[PDB]
């Protein structure tokens, strides 16, 4: 259903906002425990620094020794107790409950494919989509290099090397312009050189594999692809 797709995402948004509230209350709980523990450690720093500057005179008076015995026997356990106290259960329970209502792998490919379909439908280059310049629409939204990478991967699994090539290039461009990302250029060139190969651009595939090996000279498949590419080309002659 088209309008039930939107109703489902809208519901998912309300669910996700609530997960954020539960998450913020969790953070608030950790900060309070950590602040208590922090105060407690500092207090312990004072007791120990002053002790260590004359340990023998300190330990003989038995009142101090009594204090020393009690801290390790009793106060450090209370601290272990405070330290071991889990503050995340409220949040985790809630999230565990909410994941029943979460989307799966299939919903994620669907959204990816709808992006590929709008791109094909409106004839957009990938940089336009990523930069949020869609046929008038505000507000702008953007794709990370890693988003680009994922779209490249959805196309790939369907053996759509046209879109695979396109999105890996988009990811690559963004890494090259200097975007900080969890995705690395070698992974992209791996997929990219490959898509270029299925599509019969032997030259481009050879070049890209060389760029990969520049970054990773011991990349096992890229080394194999290099020898292979070079072989077929010498034989097309």
């Amino acid at each position: 259903g088209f309008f039930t797709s939107i109703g489902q995402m809208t519901d998912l948004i309300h669910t996700e906002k609530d997960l954020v509230t539960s998450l913020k209350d969790y953070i608030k709980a950790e900060e309070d425990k950590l602040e208590q523990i922090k105060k407690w450690a500092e207090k312990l720093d004072r007791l120990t620094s002053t002790a260590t500057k004359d340990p023998e005179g300190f330990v003989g008076h038995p009142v101090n020794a009594f204090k020393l015995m009690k801290r390790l026997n009793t106060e450090w356990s209370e601290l272990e107790n405070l330290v071991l106290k889990d503050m995340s259960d409220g949040f985790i329970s809630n999230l565990t409950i909410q994941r029943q209502y979460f989307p799966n792998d299939e919903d994620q490919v669907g959204a990816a494919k709808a992006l590929l379909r709008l791109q094909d439908t409106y004839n957009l280059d990938t940089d336009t989509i990523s930069k949020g310049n869609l046929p008038g629409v505000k507000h702008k939204s953007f794709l990370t290099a890693e988003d680009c990478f994922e779209l490249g991967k959805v196309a790939y699994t369907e053996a759509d090397y046209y879109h695979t090539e396109l999105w890996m290039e988009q990811a690559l461009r963004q890494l090259d312009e200097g975007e900080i990302s969890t995705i690395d250029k070698v992974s992209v060139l791996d997929y990219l050189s490959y898509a270029v190969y299925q599509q019969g651009d032997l030259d481009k595939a050879l070049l890209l594999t060389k760029k990969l090996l520049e970054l990773d000279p011991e990349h096992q498949r890229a080394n194999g692809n290099l020898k292979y590419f070079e072989y077929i080309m010498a034989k097309e002659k």
Partner: peptide, 9 residues
Amino acid sequence: PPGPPGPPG
């Protein structure tokens, strides 16, 4: 003779 590219993959 070399072998063909595997999936990246």
